[PDB]
Design a protein around this ligand. Structure first.
Ligand SMILES: Nc1ncnc2c1ncn2[C@@H]1O[C@H](COP(=O)(O)OP(=O)(O)O)[C@@H](O)[C@H]1O
Length: 249
């Protein structure tokens, strides 16, 4: 129904050490929440996340949850754009319902700029700003975390203080970004002794990170595919073949 404790922890993410400093507070907010209540603070209620596709926006959210040991709740970004005029947006009115009971906890809204621009479609929106303003208790600490691609078209309303009042920007890894991921995801794979990792970090430039992680696997299956038992630098090179976003008309 509604519960999924994450086992991710900050390490699982490579690069972005600044990006994550920016969410360290969020963890101390869920770990020792009484320390601010017994002192009269006002824990923010929702941090935004902005970068290109497959880069940690989700992973980082889950890391936070995970370090804090607090439940994590997902929100189908593209799920509330395939409904009709009737049965909808109540998954919002219940997502917090379950969050508030097992609080401290965390809502994650991947692709918020998918429902943050008929009797729709601001149906799912307008009702987000409801459960996120109030409503019946201030005591239990629940932090929504949303992610977005183009925060340019991001609905102006959502950054009005009390909602997504701050953000944490994080984009494509640099070169040393690429090496760290590449290194992260290399673990567990048999390797070739002729694997110039830096080399791939270099044929790979302006690539997401999810993609890197993928490249490593496309490599490795291509391996087992022709039976070879190494995963040679040739294979990695041979991968980076999926590094083709293709035509989309
Ligand atoms: N810095 C990173 N270190 C390790 N893996 C990463 C990193 N960034 C992205 N990934 C990989 O990308 C995949 C998920 O993409 P995600 O970041 O969840 O999407 P988005 O960034 O669009 O929310 C994860 O399985 C993760 O392994």
């Amino acid at each position: 129904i509604n519960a999924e404790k994450p086992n991710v922890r900050f390490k699982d993410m490579a690069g972005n050490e600044e990006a994550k400093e920016e969410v360290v507070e969020i963890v101390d907010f869920l770990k020792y929440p009484e320390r601010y209540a017994n002192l009269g603070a006002k824990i923010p209620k929702g941090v935004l996340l902005v970068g290109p596709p497959g880069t940690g926006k989700t992973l980082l959210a889950k890391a936070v949850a995970g370090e804090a040991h607090v439940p994590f709740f997902s929100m189908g970004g593209s799920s509330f754009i395939e409904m009709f005029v009737g049965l909808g947006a109540s998954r919002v009115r219940d997502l917090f319902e379950t969050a508030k009971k097992q609080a401290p906890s965390i809502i994650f809204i991947d692709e918020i700029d998918a429902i943050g621009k008929n009797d729709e479609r601001e149906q799912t929106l307008n009702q987000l700003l409801a459960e996120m303003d109030g409503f019946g208790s201030e005591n239990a600490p629940v932090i929504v975390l949303a992610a977005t691609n183009r925060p340019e078209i991001l609905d102006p309303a959502l950054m009005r203080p009390g909602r997504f009042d701050r953000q944490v920007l994080v984009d494509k890894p640099d070169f040393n970004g690429r090496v760290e991921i590449l290194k992260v995801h290399i673990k567990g794979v048999k390797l070739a002794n002729d694997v110039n990792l830096q080399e791939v970090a270099k044929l790979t430039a302006g690539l997401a990170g999810a993609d890197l992680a993928n490249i490593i696997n496309e490599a490795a299956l291509l391996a087992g595919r022709n039976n070879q038992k190494e995963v040679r630098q040739q294979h990695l090179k041979e991968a980076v073949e999926r590094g083709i976003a293709g035509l989309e008309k």
